Design an enzyme around this catalytic site. Structure first.
Site, PDB file in Angstrom:
ATOM      1  N   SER A 242       0.825  -1.202   0.000  1.00  0.00           N
ATOM      2  CA  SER A 242       0.000   0.000   0.000  1.00  0.00           C
ATOM      3  C   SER A 242       0.861   1.255   0.000  1.00  0.00           C
ATOM      4  O   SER A 242       0.536   2.238  -0.675  1.00  0.00           O
ATOM      5  CB  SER A 242      -0.935  -0.007   1.208  1.00  0.00           C
ATOM      6  N   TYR A 245       1.831   3.125  -3.123  1.00  0.00           N
ATOM      7  CA  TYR A 245       0.852   4.034  -3.698  1.00  0.00           C
ATOM      8  C   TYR A 245       0.878   5.415  -3.058  1.00  0.00           C
ATOM      9  O   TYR A 245       0.171   6.310  -3.533  1.00  0.00           O
ATOM     10  CB  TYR A 245      -0.547   3.431  -3.578  1.00  0.00           C
ATOM     11  N   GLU A 328      -4.219  -9.327  -2.084  1.00  0.00           N
ATOM     12  CA  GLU A 328      -5.069  -8.189  -2.405  1.00  0.00           C
ATOM     13  C   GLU A 328      -6.484  -8.532  -1.968  1.00  0.00           C
ATOM     14  O   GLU A 328      -6.976  -9.621  -2.270  1.00  0.00           O
ATOM     15  CB  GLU A 328      -5.044  -7.862  -3.903  1.00  0.00           C
TER      16      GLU A 328
HETATM   17  C1  LIG Z   1      -4.055   0.321  -8.585  1.00  0.00           C
HETATM   18  C2  LIG Z   1      -5.236   0.279  -7.622  1.00  0.00           C
HETATM   19  C3  LIG Z   1      -6.468  -0.392  -8.237  1.00  0.00           C
HETATM   20  C4  LIG Z   1      -7.671   0.227  -7.519  1.00  0.00           C
HETATM   21  C5  LIG Z   1      -7.164   1.567  -6.958  1.00  0.00           C
HETATM   22  N1  LIG Z   1      -5.727   1.642  -7.296  1.00  0.00           N
HETATM   23  C6  LIG Z   1      -4.954   2.413  -6.325  1.00  0.00           C
HETATM   24  C7  LIG Z   1      -4.535   1.676  -5.061  1.00  0.00           C
HETATM   25  N2  LIG Z   1      -4.257   2.389  -4.031  1.00  0.00           N
HETATM   26  N3  LIG Z   1      -3.856   1.869  -2.806  1.00  0.00           N
HETATM   27  C8  LIG Z   1      -3.604   0.665  -2.194  1.00  0.00           C
HETATM   28  O1  LIG Z   1      -3.247   0.700  -1.019  1.00  0.00           O
HETATM   29  C9  LIG Z   1      -3.745  -0.645  -2.890  1.00  0.00           C
HETATM   30  C10 LIG Z   1      -3.471  -1.816  -2.197  1.00  0.00           C
HETATM   31  C11 LIG Z   1      -3.607  -3.037  -2.861  1.00  0.00           C
HETATM   32  F1  LIG Z   1      -3.336  -4.161  -2.168  1.00  0.00           F
HETATM   33  C12 LIG Z   1      -4.000  -3.176  -4.176  1.00  0.00           C
HETATM   34  C13 LIG Z   1      -4.271  -1.992  -4.856  1.00  0.00           C
HETATM   35  N4  LIG Z   1      -4.680  -1.761  -6.152  1.00  0.00           N
HETATM   36  C14 LIG Z   1      -4.815  -0.413  -6.351  1.00  0.00           C
HETATM   37  C15 LIG Z   1      -4.494   0.247  -5.189  1.00  0.00           C
HETATM   38  C16 LIG Z   1      -4.147  -0.738  -4.221  1.00  0.00           C
END
Ligand SMILES: C[C@]12CCCN1CC1=NNC(=O)c3cc(F)cc4[nH]c2c1c34
Length: 351
Positions: A242, A245, A328
């Site tokens: 996370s 991001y 995820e």
């Molecule tokens: C690329 C994607 C897809 C839907 C929104 N996007 C932004 C995102 N933001 N943040 C996270 O903390 C995160 C954690 C995950 F385990 C999988 C994730 N997939 C995404 C995110 C994401």
């Protein structure tokens, strides 16, 4: 001049997330042309038009159109969402990762529209702007003690679930806030089993919107092929997945990490991506992208009614040909999400 009545910790938080100048610098790094489309002129309709253009590109890709149709579809998008590529021609959009990149640009722009609307909602003179911005969030942010059990488990959660592949940096917990967004307790599904405390990261530009509107579901205009597991809210059990991001830098090494209680219920476990995973639920309540490495239940603890998947993480043998390194979790109704803890984190880059 009215002085601030907020905790000095909350004061620093609002300053970080309401820094419009930092928002303009972030969008320019994403190649967005702020001169041609200033952030103060952002509208919901313009962003939605960008989503529909990406959907049109997805229609070209599905129809095998890689010529004039694709070029004219991308041109329409780049005209509604202008980019700065110098004197070069704007790159064509084709892959899922390239679609997702633009989706993430649109998601930042959407939350940025919320942030400007909020800072412009200040009645100057009435009270300090930081207190005004905070109240207009309609989200409680209560600083917590660093010797509290909350701070101990969450600091453990942060260090213990840092992924080995994300070895370019470490993370120092600077501060911790309890989060109460209006209405989340009343809509939450306390009935659903498998309530877990999961991470979610985002760029600094998006936290006014997240804390004001909650984690939201992608709009209907968006192409589903940009979401590896469909239009839901995504969470991780590995903090660094996370935290990537947050898109922190050595010069902007402060970021925010959100911990939320997620009512996953029975998980529909998938070995590979499928943007149409919501139709595969079949009475199940969440999609779980199976990762090769995940925290083990032998280290789990409970913090206020939810399970904390503390590390150290071990391998699961998942090897289905790009498999997910880490897990995820995706829920498709916001009533399965309750924001709880906000982490102010210092990123320690290891050159
Ligand atoms: C690329 C994607 C897809 C839907 C929104 N996007 C932004 C995102 N933001 N943040 C996270 O903390 C995160 C954690 C995950 F385990 C999988 C994730 N997939 C995404 C995110 C994401």
């Amino acid at each position: 001049g009215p002085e601030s009545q907020l905790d000095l910790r909350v004061q620093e938080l609002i300053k970080l997330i309401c820094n419009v100048q930092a928002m303009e610098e972030m969008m320019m790094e994403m190649k967005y042309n702020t001169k041609k489309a200033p952030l103060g002129k952002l509208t919901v309709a313009q962003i939605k038009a960008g989503y529909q253009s990406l959907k049109k590109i997805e229609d070209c890709i599905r129809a095998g159109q890689h010529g004039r149709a694709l070029m004219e579809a991308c041109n329409e998008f780049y005209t509604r969402i202008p980019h700065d590529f110098g004197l070069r021609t704007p790159p064509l959009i084709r892959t899922q990762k390239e679609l997702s990149e633009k989706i993430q640009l649109l998601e930042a722009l959407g939350d940025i529209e919320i942030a400007i609307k909020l800072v412009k909602s200040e009645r100057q003179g009435l009270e300090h702007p930081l207190d005004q911005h905070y109240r207009n969030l309609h989200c409680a942010l209560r600083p917590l003690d660093h010797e509290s059990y909350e701070f101990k488990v969450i600091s453990q959660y942060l260090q213990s679930t840092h992924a080995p592949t994300h070895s370019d940096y470490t993370m120092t917990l600077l501060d911790l806030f309890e989060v109460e967004k209006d209405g989340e307790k009343e809509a939450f599904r306390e009935d659903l089993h498998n309530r877990m405390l999961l991470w979610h990261g985002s760029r600094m530009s998006n936290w006014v919107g997240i804390l004001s509107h909650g984690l939201r579901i992608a709009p209907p205009e968006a192409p589903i092929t940009g979401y590896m597991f469909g239009k839901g809210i995504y969470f991780a059990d590995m903090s660094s997945k996370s935290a990537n991001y947050c898109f922190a830098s050595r010069l902007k090494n402060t970021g925010l990490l959100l911990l939320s209680e997620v009512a996953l219920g029975q998980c529909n476990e998938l070995l590979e991506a499928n943007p149409k995973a919501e139709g595969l639920l079949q009475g199940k309540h969440s999609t779980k992208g199976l990762g090769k490495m995940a925290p083990s239940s032998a280290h789990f603890v409970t913090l206020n009614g939810s399970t904390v998947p503390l590390g150290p993480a071990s391998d699961t043998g998942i090897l289905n040909g790009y498999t997910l390194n880490y897990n995820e979790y995706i829920v498709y109704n916001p009533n399965q999400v309750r924001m709880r803890y906000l982490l102010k984190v210092q990123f320690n880059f290891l050159q």
